[PDB]
Amino acid sequence: GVEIETISPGDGRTFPKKGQTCVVHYTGMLQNGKKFDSSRDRNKPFKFRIGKQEVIKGFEEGAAQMSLGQRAKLTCTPDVAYGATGHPGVIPPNATLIFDVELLNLE
Known about the structure:
It catalyses: [protein]-peptidylproline (omega=180) = [protein]-peptidylproline (omega=0). This protein is mainly beta. It has one helix at about 55-65, and strands at about 5-10, 20-25, 25-30, 35-40, 45-50, 70-75, 95-105. It has 1 helix and 7 strands; from the N terminus they run E-E-E-E-E-H-E-E. Strands 1, 2, 3, 4, 5, 6 and 7 form a 7-stranded antiparallel sheet that branches.
């Protein structure tokens, strides 16, 4: 499943809850070698609810186990990611994901 590595630690207490609006900068990279997307690059913070499933399952569960103000690496396995078909046109077949997550503020 999901495999968190801490980059820099946060508060170490206030995790995301049911119904909370997570506010996050990010940059998404494929299995070894190259990046595919970035929220920082586009000049706008990204907003997603936990529990209501507005995003992919690995992004929703890795974020929830992280702390407020934490920077961390999410090495999510393909079964909890886009996987065998992948996202048509966008995300290729058989791909372990690597996320550069930074939890700005819970709301």
